[PDB]
Amino acid sequence: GSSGSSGRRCQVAFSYLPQNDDELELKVGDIIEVVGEVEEGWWEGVLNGKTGMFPSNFIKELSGPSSG
């Protein structure tokens, strides 16, 4: 019994403007592919190819057959 878990998706519930040139720009409706985790309350993902540290306290994970 072995599996390979890698690649997560989450929808941005709150838009976030990057005050730096190393942050991600969250936009209500945006989906960041959680690649890893920066720090407590901060996760790491991709925003349409982009990448940067963002707060995981302003999104909403998505699992199972959860569609709009």
CA-CA distance, 61 to 40, in Å (whole number)? 16
Owner of token pair 């190819």: 49
Residue pair 26/53 in contact by the 8 Å Cβ criterion = no
Nearest to 10 by CA among 65, 60, 66: 60
Tokens of 43: 């996760």
CA-CA distance, 43 to 12, in Å (whole number)? 12
Upper half-sphere CA count for residue 12 (Cβ side, 13 Å):
21
Residue numbers followed by a gap, the chain, C–N over 2.5 Å? none
> Where exactly are the structural domains of the chain?
1-68
User: The domain 1-68 is classified under which CATH number: 2.30.30.40, 1.10.357.10, 1.10.287.950, 2.40.50.140?
Assistant: 2.30.30.40
Measured CA distances, 45 to 18, 39, 49, 68 (Å) = 14, 12, 9, 22
Upper half-sphere CA count for residue 37 (Cβ side, 13 Å):
7
